[PDB]
Amino acid sequence: PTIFEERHLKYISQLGKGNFGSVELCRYDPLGDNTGALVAVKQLQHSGPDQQRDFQREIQILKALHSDFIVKYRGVSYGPGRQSLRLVMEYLPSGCLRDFLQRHRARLDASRLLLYSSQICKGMEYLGSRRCVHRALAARNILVESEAHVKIADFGLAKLLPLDKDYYVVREPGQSPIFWYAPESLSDNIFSRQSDVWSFGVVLYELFTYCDKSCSPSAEFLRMMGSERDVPALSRLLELLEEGQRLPAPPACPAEVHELMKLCWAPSPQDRPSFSALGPQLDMLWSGSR
Numbered sequence: 001p002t003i004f005e006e007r008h009l010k011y012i013s014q015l016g017k018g019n020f021g022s023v024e025l026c027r028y029d030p031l032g033d034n035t036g037a038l039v040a041v042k043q044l045q046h047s048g049p050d051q052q053r054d055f056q057r058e059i060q061i062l063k064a065l066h067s068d069f070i071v072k073y074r075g076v077s078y079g080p081g082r083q084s085l086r087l088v089m090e091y092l093p094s095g096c097l098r099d100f101l102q103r104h105r106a107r108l109d110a111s112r113l114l115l116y117s118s119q120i121c122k123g124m125e126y127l128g129s130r131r132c133v134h135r136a137l138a139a140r141n142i143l144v145e146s147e148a149h150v151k152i153a154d155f156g157l158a159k160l161l162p163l164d165k166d167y168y169v170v171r172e173p174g175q176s177p178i179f180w181y182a183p184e185s186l187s188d189n190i191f192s193r194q195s196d197v198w199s200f201g202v203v204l205y206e207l208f209t210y211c212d213k214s215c216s217p218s219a220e221f222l223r224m225m226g227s228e229r230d231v232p233a234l235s236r237l238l239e240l241l242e243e244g245q246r247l248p249a250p251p252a253c254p255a256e257v258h259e260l261m262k263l264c265w266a267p268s269p270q271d272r273p274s275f276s277a278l279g280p281q282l283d284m285l286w287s288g289s290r
């Protein structure tokens, strides 16, 4: 089913919200008897020309990816007046990894966190082979399919690299989650697969702190930023990073995983390991742990 008849998408609730977009939980119920499959459905509201263009791109990217570790595209449906599309995807009832880690902390061991690390890395390896920069990778937009299975979601900011170039540049984002971004992204608006590796090291930090709010990247920054408190965060963060300061090793985090983090956060993009180099190292550590 490539086209989902709007009439059969039964609205249930909202799942989540960005500025320009929402995701809704719907049942696709073509028998009309409320027995059909749940789906997540994304649509724009309150968006300009660039946001609409960016959404058709989002759709095309997700539709082309077939990975166990990337949230699955199902189809499209029509929005109001059949003047717009909605992006129909599989529904993962366990929600985002960030919140799952906080709720289930007590029973998720290092081996399970290594499994999630390995799965995310594999997904990113898959993206990388399709010249896709995710950009937004964070625990808050990774989804839990089952207790032993996660998937990368939220392709709102994803972009394909041209055949002939290994990065792109944007106009200064008005607002971005600065504590996940590589320094070249913060300072020169450069994004690449290697800037995704930086963000992945911050994902490893998220995983091995169980996304505890007390040692969040923001909380660590405020601890680290120093005595001068009226200094703009982004300005101060870039200085800290330039000086070689990095998020600290979580108390419980295996030393080898911390070492991977530090490699991910190499100052020079070309000095960071690729996802294909990270994957076997994480796989080895996960294997070790079960």
Ligand SMILES: *CCC(=O)Nc1cccc(-c2c[nH]c3ncc(C(N)=O)cc23)c1
Binding pocket: 015, 016, 017, 023, 040, 071, 072, 089, 090, 091, 092, 093, 094, 095, 096, 097, 098, 099, 140, 143, 153, 154
């Ligand atoms: C954890 C906080 C948060 O933002 N969670 C969130 C936001 C938006 C959507 C979801 C969600 C939950 N289950 C889903 N299944 C699939 C998809 C999808 N295909 O994009 C999104 C889902 C959770």
Ligand SMILES: NC(=O)Nc1ccccc1
Binding pocket: 179, 202, 217, 218, 220, 221, 224, 240, 245, 246, 247, 265
């Ligand atoms: N990658 C990395 O270490 N980022 C960072 C550093 C200090 C505070 C907050 C985030």
